[PDB]
Design an enzyme around this catalytic site. Structure first.
Site, short mmCIF file in Angstrom:
data_model
loop_
_atom_site.label_atom_id
_atom_site.label_comp_id
_atom_site.label_asym_id
_atom_site.label_seq_id
_atom_site.Cartn_x
_atom_site.Cartn_y
_atom_site.Cartn_z
N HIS A 166 52.84 33.58 109.93
CA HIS A 166 53.69 33.34 108.94
C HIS A 166 54.07 32.19 109.09
CE1 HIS A 166 57.17 35.50 110.43
NE2 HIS A 166 58.17 33.99 109.92
N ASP A 212 52.27 40.49 114.76
CA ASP A 212 52.49 39.65 114.73
C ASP A 212 53.19 38.01 114.99
OD1 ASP A 212 52.46 40.01 111.84
OD2 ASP A 212 54.54 41.16 111.69
N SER A 263 61.93 31.27 113.30
CA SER A 263 60.70 31.83 113.69
C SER A 263 60.61 31.57 115.30
CB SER A 263 60.32 31.55 113.13
OG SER A 263 60.32 32.62 111.62
#
Lengths: 150, 150, 150, 150
Positions: A27, A49, A101
């Site tokens: 993302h 992910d 992140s």
């Protein structure tokens, strides 16, 4: 040991090179601050992910080795500290948000354990979303309820 | 000084703006980490391992000159002290290697006498592959047999 | 506050920001420096000698806010000062070269009302072309005849 | 004995004499501020951008004279010095400008080594075009490409 993923002047995520190659959240998009490890072609894995892709012999020893050894105690974090609560790592209130992140944690011996995705609070102090490895050597996600991607 | 050539991050050799214009050895390849000098077509001379190009309108003064002046004596270099005896160039053992492809040797005054290509060793002391002017303006090649260039 | 222009290993002109907008001169060509600053596009008005555009809203804490008066006094500048006579702006003898067209002027309280484009020399004092503002707020050029853009 | 040449109120270049012959550039138009030698007949030569003259038996003693040989070293100029190696007259910029085409460069003995014409900019220095003559004595003109003369 740190390589950001930003896009047009704002923070979005920070990559790491663990044990022989790199990884990066899915993302989080845009510029990464190298042209060596940007030139490689990357394999994406949607279920964890995180994508994976090999780095050449130029990065043979600048990486950070990992473990699964998590006894109960306090360890160091890039913006503070953690707390081992039965496999549920957690972050103090308000600290950590957008642009955090792929931030790794680090032990008292120079060993990396956790990769992050997001976070969600329960009660007095905010829990976070972990990618970690077990004593058998296979990878885990421990995602809280309502943990949107940072 | 000289300008280096960067293949995939690290050192390969050194591009010599010497004597008025640009020279770079044909043994190593790669591109230059300086933008104003690689914006033009550069012709090659594959006879004796050197490339010939132009320079822009701001590198005539600071470019170090060549005069083929040979008194037999101890000259100097970034990794030792090369000298000219018997019609040869020589450095003792355990020196140089890949990445040192094109660093020139100089004199006591501060100008160039020779540009190194590389070579190997056959004997008690290592000879070097070189491209060096002579009295008649001839770029005569002195390289012993059995020495691949660095 | 002044952000340069990348040409070929030098600077051609410069660019600044005002009120949440962007400057450029028509005669100044080339790529601008910043990642968020190049990607916004220029609704250009070339005959009024300014190429405006809207800036990112993360740049809302860098721009300036103005009025439109010009009381007599003295205006400081990068190359010293610029004096206020005849309702005009003229630079002294010798000072002022090429490439400074695009960079603003200031006063003691520190607010830009004027930016530089050209030049015209009659004897000692040199009268350079200035974009300034009306009390109605419309662009104004005090161009001398026989001017010369830098 | 450098003589001034002025056209209708401005200064464009200065006049020189060596060997009894009045050499001035045909670069800029300009008229003579003297009654004596204003009627000396000349023969327009456009090969060298120079043209000779003649001296009567009134200024026949006080004529500064020439040289054919030159040693490598420093000299005496109106604003500094000049070095000569690699077939080059060059000075750094700042010193010297317009109105210098026709000011003599001379040796510390007092002999006219050459007479300048203008030149170019090169980085931190200025490649200065000149007319001179070697040990052959044939008048040589030096043309650096990229030069607008003074």
């Amino acid at each position: 040991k740190t390589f950001p993923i930003m896009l047009n002047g704002q923070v979005n995520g920070y990559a790491c090179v663990v044990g022989g190659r790199l990884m990066k959240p899915l993302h989080v998009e845009g510029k990464i601050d190298n042209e060596q490890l940007a030139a490689v072609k990357l394999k994406k894995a949607s279920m964890y992910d995180l994508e994976y892709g090999d780095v050449p012999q130029n990065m043979k020893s600048d990486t950070l080795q990992y473990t699964s050894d998590k006894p109960p105690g306090f360890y160091n974090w890039h913006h503070g500290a953690v707390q081992y609560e039965n496999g549920r790592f957690t972050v103090p209130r308000g600290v950590g948000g957008k642009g955090d992140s792929g931030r790794p944690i680090l032990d008292n011996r120079g060993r990396v354990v956790a990769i992050v995705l997001g976070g969600a609070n329960e009660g007095t102090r905010t829990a976070l979303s972990v990618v970690t490895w077990n004593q058998k050597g296979v990878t885990i996600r421990d995602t809280p309820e309502g943990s949107e991607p940072w």
